[model samples]
Target: LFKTRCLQCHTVEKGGPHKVGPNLHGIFGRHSGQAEGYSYTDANIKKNVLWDENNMSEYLTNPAKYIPGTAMAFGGLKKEKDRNDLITYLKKATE
Candidate 1:
């Protein structure tokens, strides 16, 4: 799913820079919109948040609703399993 969808912008490897979107390394447990050198919108930055599993799940299901004005262009993951799998993969890869 990542290859078919998210890999166009995000990267799991360390030291990767923000692409069309921010590099997703160490995203879990990270504060929302706090990636170094990546400029986040006022809405995202001042949101005062962290990327916990529950939040990630919700965001994966509906990104626009979670953070309005986000630059992510994809609609969202429609399946619970798909979102879980993507989260699992992201945790493993980023760790």
Candidate 2:
């Protein structure tokens, strides 16, 4: 599910490389738009949100709805199970 949805833009591997989106290694607890070596939009940087589970939950559920000017183009994961499992997967892989 993550690869299908996330890999198009994000690279989960640490010390590897990034794509259109920033590398998501150790993403949790990190502030939005602050990932090193990546360029972020003024709109994204201005959000200044901590990438905690709750904040991430809202944003990931509907990125455009949450932040209209952000660079993410995803339609979002609508299924609760999918979002839950994606969060679970993110916790494991992003560590």
Instruction: Name the TM-score of candidate 1.
Output: 0.64
Residue pairs with clashing backbones, model 2: none
What C-alpha lDDT does candidate 1 achieve relative to the native structure?
0.60
Write candidate 1's Cα lDDT for 19-39 as tens digits: 565666665677666665456
List the candidates' TM-scores in order.
Answer: 0.64, 0.64
Model 2 has an lDDT value of 0.60
For candidate 2, the clash count comes to 0
In model 1, pairs of residues that clash are: none
Query: Distance from true position, residue 14, model 2, in Å?
Result: 4.7
Give candidates' CA RMSD values in order. Answer: 3.7, 3.7
